[PDB]
Amino acid sequence: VMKXXXXXXXXXXXXXXXXXXXXXXXXXXXXXXXXXXXXXXXXXXX
């Protein structure tokens, strides 16, 4: 984001005091092989 409108600040929440897990749903979009291994507690189970 450099040419758009998003500042990438303040976050989605309007409270800006609590701040939950946040990167539970995010956990970096890049490299899908690492994301699939991270969310596989029930699946495979090794």
């Binding site: 998003x6 989605x12 929440x13 309007x14 409270x15 609590x18 939950x20 979009x29």
Partner: protein, 89 residues
């Protein structure tokens, strides 16, 4: 309730209540605002005083505001194809 339950307990209905052992709710902190905001009848009939604390609480369960934001990043990441793209990991 049409008939109230006086001198007897059979609730355990609302979220962020008495835990089975000690297990927390996913939106525990947000209802600590919401129940404390709307314990009186002031924002129950009007529902305007606790609008700020409700929008963040609706954001906790659905995550729609983050969903639109992450889609905007992913689309712009796809826009960088055959352009000035870089991947640190």
């Amino acid at each position: 309730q049409k008939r109230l339950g006086v001198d007897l307990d059979r609730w355990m209905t609302i979220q962020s209540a008495e835990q089975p052992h000690g297990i927390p709710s996913r939106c525990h902190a947000f209802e600590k605002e919401w129940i404390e905001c709307a314990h009186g009848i002031g924002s129950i009939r009007a529902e305007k005083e606790c609008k700020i604390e409700f929008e963040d609480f609706r954001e906790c369960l659905l995550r729609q505001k983050t969903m639109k934001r992450l889609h905007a990043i992913r689309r712009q990441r796809e826009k960088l194809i055959k352009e000035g793209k870089y991947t640190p990991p």
